[PDB]
Symmetry: C3
Subunit: 346 residues, 3 copies
């Protein structure tokens, strides 16, 4: 097994280590696990795009527990399970209060855990996902909590970037990736998580925002510590801009965030913020020719429909890639055992 | 090697044309396709009634999107998918506003379309289903919208009628089917759709209604155009009545509707009908049909609802099958 | 096919259980209870050894839950899916909004044409019986407001039989002593289990604050059933208002404030005592007990998987049996 046809992947060895691992945080994924996820993820991409058998995990039964509406993420996990050939029982359209009708998180996960092979859990509370992990006799995949932990979003963001700039794996001092994060860097937690993971590689960061909504010093410290550990830190590593014109020069990746209306003092600030950072074909004319545009979605006005037609636009391929990356993670974690002949290979 | 009464079906040829067809409107189904749906539909009826292997479409993953409560139709589509051996992901008990959460229908179907092989979509908005079809990289089956497009209801209504009156396929000047539509002909959109399909054959129509609630001239014109194309139109093709005793004489089919005291079906009302008369109702009923009639052999509305399973299985098989061989098709 | 001592004709018992509807624990006779316990154990051992569990593929069920009972719903879904079958779900609706002015008769006459069987939970007693008379397919009652909950009763019994297998023997010399603690008036899981336990050689301690004691209705049924098997005595049914007396010489404690279970309260019970609770608990059992080896309430919940798989297998199969 090979990735970038350069890095050799012992999926037997890496699956033995990943067996029944719970994935709460992007920090629960090390270098060799990230390689295994990217290789396996690509095999699912190529098998599904060629209309081939995808049933690499058949005999499993999951429970999906979504205690807030996040239909896109929920359907993405259901599709991955179902396309792998396994089965799922769904708990949706409930919250914390209505689902845990008094009963403790501990008791609830101790019970449900005896019914199934694993649990997909989305809950705005960060408390609950950690209680779930300590009470469950089965692996949990965090599909998102209010600490901004969303490992599969982070994983799928990375897979998308690696697809166009495979050198980001190399940790080569001469092959640096430059990325701009645009919009609400304070509340865009998908930025926080992806930044942390990108930070493990040779990466420079443009943080494009309007003071009130800047990246937290929290995440800048983590980025800095991680670049220093790999001797990729310089005074050029992290740059700050309040405008696209400067923000978007010499970056391989533009990652747009949600600018939600509920986040300003009024609709005054909002429309003066939205339309400031709105992405046009005009805004993109002075970017690199190889620039790729990511957005975790849903996009509202952040990106005008005209950009969907620009070849540098890949946000929908990004969403699509979530299927392959969730299939890969499930296969690696829940596969009963490993022989080499069993593994997805196109 | 595939026949419906006496007409030979090239199911291979018809499936090549139907592959990844989106079915929004009854008019998306032509003669050859309607025959394929009726043959396939009958095969599933006979396979399920004899407790036989049903799994003619495994390996497929669907999304069902119901943005209004339509539990019976939803369960019917889920049962068809599951009994064919495929799998489905459900989005229900949400509305337009609460599901799209401000995001565009275009974006939503462009994404969901990448997760699955096909989408079942029910939405009161007619706008949304057509946007979904233009934005989706996969086939859509309309499970109902507020334009009164409901192709599988129309298809299942037709399968039920053909089951008792197979001559409706013959387009024989001497073998005419007479049907009475009773109740709210203005708002009963299942009448509108079925009329349009029946209209392609040798059929006479009794439209039995209130005053405020008669069939719209829109539908009468479509019936007339379609009868004229096959030279089955006469001044006796379309008749109007305000009462059952006249409404229900010499009609092979009675099709009752949701009439939200004068258009109530009794055993008494049915004494003046033909012996071979069959009674349809898309359901749910309230008082339009008295529980008495559920015991009358002419009553087939529950077999009709049952037939929804076989017809939705047939349509999913014909659209989503990833096949090459005649031998692989249901042939029990 | 044996339970060590009793030989089971699973072929013969499945022929009689085929397409049986299960509403009430009284719909299950001796032979059927044996088949459910044998089959239940086979699925326990197959799942604990990570073996193929797909003994009922090719079926499609509908699950209709018209009140929140998420644990019970998920338990049934897991059983169906682990058997290899499929299910279509109707949940997070109630009676009013589900039967949108349409009759239960029409609803079940239609839905029953779409699927091989129906799991139905509804607080109304009326509705489950209408559903059974109007359905062309078998119904499993997952709970109604008459306190009929056969699979809870079945799973309670399997749990007890697991530690005290002699409860099957109807041996005058091998008696099981059980204490039911808490709200015996409203705890309908007590009523149903009492009725089933009553068919065997069992003595009952009813521990409550009087206002909430077991209804005379249930005591009469316990007495009729003990008399039919000549296990009734003046010691068959005792009443207490306190644990220290309540919990002496009882093989089973079944929990449903002086009725709160501590490690302290458990010190003067038998060494073989096992603690059941249908769950969810609040304070009736302190988290400290969850660490006591007598504590088996979570194994009990777990056993609901094996027992619902067994019941679905026995009713909907068309037959090679689960073994080993
Ligand atoms: N909150 C928006 C949900 C719409 C959607 C569902 C599944 C996939 C893509 C979009
Ligand atoms: N709100 C009406 C639901 C009744 C019904 C459910 C499923 C199938 C047939 C009828
Ligand atoms: N009383 C809250 C229900 C929580 C639960 C869900 C599924 C399985 C077990 C418990
Ligand atoms: Na499902």
């Amino acid at each position: 097994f090979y990735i970038n046809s350069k890095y050799k992947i012992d999926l037997d060895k890496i699956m033995t280590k990943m067996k029944n691992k719970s994935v709460i945080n992007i920090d629960d994924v090390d270098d060799e696990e990230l390689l295994a996820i990217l290789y396996t993820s690509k095999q699912f991409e190529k098998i599904l795009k060629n209309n081939e058998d995808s049933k690499y995990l058949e005999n499993k039964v999951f429970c999906s527990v979504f205690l807030e509406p996040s239909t896109r993420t929920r359907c993405s996990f259901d599709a991955a399970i179902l396309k792998l050939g396994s089965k799922v029982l769904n708990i949706t359209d409930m919250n914390s209060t209505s689902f845990y009708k008094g009963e403790t998180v501990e008791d609830a996960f101790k019970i449900l855990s005896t019914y199934v092979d694993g649990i997909i859990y989305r809950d705005p509370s960060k408390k609950n996902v950690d209680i779930a992990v300590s009470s469950s006799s089965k692996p949990i995949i965090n599909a998102g909590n209010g600490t901004g932990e969303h490992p599969t979003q982070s994983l799928l963001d990375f897979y998308t970037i690696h697809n166009y700039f495979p050198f980001i794996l190399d940790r080569n001092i001469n092959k640096k990736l430059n990325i701009a994060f645009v919009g609400d860097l304070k509340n865009g937690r998908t930025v926080h998580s992806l930044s942390k993971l990108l930070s493990r590689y040779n990466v420079s960061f443009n943080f494009v925002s309007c003071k009130s909504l800047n990246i937290p010093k929290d995440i800048v410290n983590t980025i800095t510590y991680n670049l220093k550990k790999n001797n990729f830190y310089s005074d050029d590593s992290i740059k700050y801009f309040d405008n696209l014109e400067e923000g978007l020069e010499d970056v391989h990746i533009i990652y747009m965030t949600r600018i939600q209306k509920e986040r300003f003092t009024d609709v005054d600030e909002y429309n003066q913020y939205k339309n400031a950072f709105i992405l046009s074909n005009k805004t993109l004319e002075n970017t690199r020719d190889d620039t790729k545009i990511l957005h975790p979605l849903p996009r509202v006005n952040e990106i005008k429909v005209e950009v969907d037609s620009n070849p540098k636009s890949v946000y929908f391929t990004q969403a699509e890639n979530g299927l392959y990356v969730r299939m890969a993670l499930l296969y690696l974690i829940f596969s009963s055992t490993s022989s080499a002949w069993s593994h997805p290979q196109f």
